[PDB]
Structure formats: C-alpha cells, structure tokens
Design a binder for this molecule. Structure first.
Ligand SMILES: [Zn+2]
Ligand SMILES: [Zn+2]
Lengths: 226, 226
C-alpha cells in the first residue's frame, strides 16, 4: 500500500533540511510520489529517482487569475513529474461554470504531458457542484481528482454539509462516478489519512485495488501505513 | 480610524457576488483599501474609486519559486494599486538569508512602483528571524510590513510562542525597530482586530498617529472599527 502514497510535506514553515529529509525518506519508503511546495522542487529533484516529484500549484486557495495559473503550471511542468493544482474554488461556489471550465482546460493543457491532479476541495462542495466539476476535470484531460488540500476550514466545510477529513464514502462516491462515466481519471484521497487502517478502508472503498495509476493516498505520515 | 483600514475578504470560497458586495461596502465606508485574491481584481476594479485596489500575492504560503513570484507580482501590478505579498516563510525558518534577500529584493522590485506590503506572518517567527527579515524588507524597498496573512495556524504559532491575533506589543516592537534603523517602512497589523478599542490600542502603540501612508489595520470586519 506504500506504493500508492503521495508523501506530502506542504506546511509553509517547512524548512529546506526538512524538505530534503522528506525526499530521502520518500525514496527509501518507495512511495508513489513526494509532494512539496514549488519552492523546494529544485533542491528535492536530485534526491528523487524512483519516486515521482509532485508539486502543488496555486495552493491552497486556487484563487489566482487563470493567466497566472497557466503560466505557473507551465513553469512547474519543466521540473515536476506531477502537478496537483487547486480548482478555482471561488468560481465554483459562484457557479460560474463557463469560467471554471475555461480555467481548468487551459490550466491542465499548460502542464504539457505531465500528470495533473485537480484538487476539488471536497470539504467546500455541494453535490450540485461536485459532479459538474468532475465532468470539467475529465473534459480538461486531467489524470487525477485529488479530494482536498489538507487546509480546508472546518466551519465553512460544515456549513456546506461536509467533514474536513477523507472518508471511505466520499472516495467511493468519486470512484463510482468516474467508473460509471467511463472517464480516464484516477482518485487521490487526502486529509486525515495517517493510519494504515484508514488508508486500507479508502482503498477498499474506491474498489480499484492497489493501482498507482488510478489510486493515490495523500498523507504527511507515510511510515504509518507500511 | 476607518481610513486606516484595509478591508480584506480573502477566504478562497468567497463568491463573485460577495466580492462585489465587499467593494461597494469598501467604497461606502471610505476604508484605505479593499484586499481580495487576484482572481477578483478585474471585477472589483470598477467599483473602487476613492479606495485603493489591494491584492495578495503567493498567498498565504509564500512558497512559490522566486521566478514565479516575480512574474506574478509583475502581472498583478498592472491592475492593483497595492500588493501584499507573502515573505518566503519556509526560507526564513531555514535562516537562508542570502536566498531570502535575493527573493524579496527581486519580488518587491517587480511591482513597478506599486505600493508593496511584505507579509511577515509574525505568528510563525522567532526574534532570531523577524529583525533580520525586517532588514531585508527595508533593503528591498517595500512600503509596508504586514504582520500576518490571517490564516496562520494556532498550533504552530503556539509552538513558536506567538499569539495568532494582532497585539499592540507586536505592533510597537515593529515600529520601534523601523524607527531605530531609520527605515522608511509602514506598519500594517492584521488578524484578530475585532474592535474599535483594539484598533485604537494598536494605533497608539505604533505611535505614528492615523497616517495611512505608514499605518494600516487589516480586518474582515471594518464596520466594527467605525
Ligand atoms: Zn490501472
Ligand atoms: Zn506620513
């Protein structure tokens, strides 16, 4: 199960030494990828060989102008293996679908070939928004739907009717939809996955077995599940 | 005192309608500036006449590589009157001063003369970091030091021995240092400023009167101020 893990150290106060130590630990554990803020991509790049270098973009708000977002992703694609970009959360809540799809198609297209995961921030969404968004993400040709940033607020999330942490039910809901629509999209759950038990539950919930190309587990405590 | 206020609506889930409402409210109140995430800059631009258009950059982590930060600030300066960019927090915690100054000097200078405020994120800093950071901010030619993003984590703050909300003690300390070093820098306290008395407390502590070019009060509840 360790090979389905995207080991994430994304706190803004993470230091160079900590980022370097993380990469080293990522390689030894054999995780699927190591995710860090863009600033540390160059220093970590040399330490990764088998494990993929994953970077977040317009994280964690997804509140940058589309023009800046495509530009950022374009640069990032020069050194990162995979890019986890936040959806335009604000525009989604505004139900500005025309703008949401214009943004995601252009942003994903800017990654030029790299594996792109769009963070939907499930804690902030309602059902009428999430499925329309999933359709847009498939339309954009993204590789994965990442459930959350790991920085969602509990208060607002609750008002939208959601828990802040990943649950097997949400994971299954996303996986069921993709499968039913026949989309070529993987599912990456993140948030509150710090025990091997919970992780296992999410994998069984998604129902695709342990396929790294279709399933990823985002966590800051990888050792805990292997 | 409302004229020293920087009315900020930065939640990623804020809607377009909410951002418009905010601009209208900003103009009615006569606050110094209205701060939003760059995505809403264009739509708010028209509703702002007397009030300055303020936008945050690489917010709230300040964890993008320098090149992207420069490009971002350059683009933002084309439509925003003021730019509140986050300092490279991770690098500051790493005490990578050579890199921190190369970054801030470059980023601030990419603003093309616009009013630039560098967010220090006081809740995450120690004395061994903040003063050297202030020196760098001055060396970079910024107009203001913004105390915090408003999204600092309570746990890490406590770990660093700092409160998350703004305090007169902190404001006075920043002011005293800039006065002693002769820096041409303003002080913008933000975060937890909920009342008129708290706001007055901060203004008195800074000791520069109600001078907008040197003192700002960032808050999401401006009405409470006056
Ligand atoms: Zn497969
Ligand atoms: Zn003055």
């Amino acid at each position: 199960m360790i090979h389905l893990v995207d080991y994430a150290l994304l706190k803004p106060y993470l230091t160079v030494d900590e980022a370097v130590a993380g990469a080293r630990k990522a390689e030894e554990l054999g995780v699927a990828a190591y995710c860090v803020n863009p600033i540390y991509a160059p220093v970590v790049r040399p330490l990764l060989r088998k494990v993929k270098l994953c970077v977040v973009a317009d994280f964690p708000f997804g509140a940058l102008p589309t023009a800046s977002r495509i530009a950022l992703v374009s640069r990032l694609a020069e050194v990162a293996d995979e890019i986890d970009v936040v959806a335009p959360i604000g525009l989604v809540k505004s139900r500005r679908w025309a703008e949401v799809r214009r943004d995601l198609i252009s942003v994903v297209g800017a990654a030029g070939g790299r594996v792109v995961k769009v963070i939907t921030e499930e804690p902030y969404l309602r059902d009428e928004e999430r499925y329309t968004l999933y359709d847009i993400i498939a339309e954009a040709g993204a590789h994965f739907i990442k459930s959350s940033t790991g920085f969602a607020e509990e208060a607002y999330a609750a008002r939208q009717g959601n828990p802040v942490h990943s649950t097997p039910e949400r994971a299954a809901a996303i996986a069921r939809y993709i499968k039913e629509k026949g989309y070529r999209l993987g599912v990456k759950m993140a948030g509150g996955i710090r025990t091997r038990e919970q992780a296992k539950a999410i994998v069984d919930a998604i129902g695709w077995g342990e396929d790294p190309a279709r399933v990823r587990l985002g966590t800051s405590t990888p050792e805990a599940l292997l």
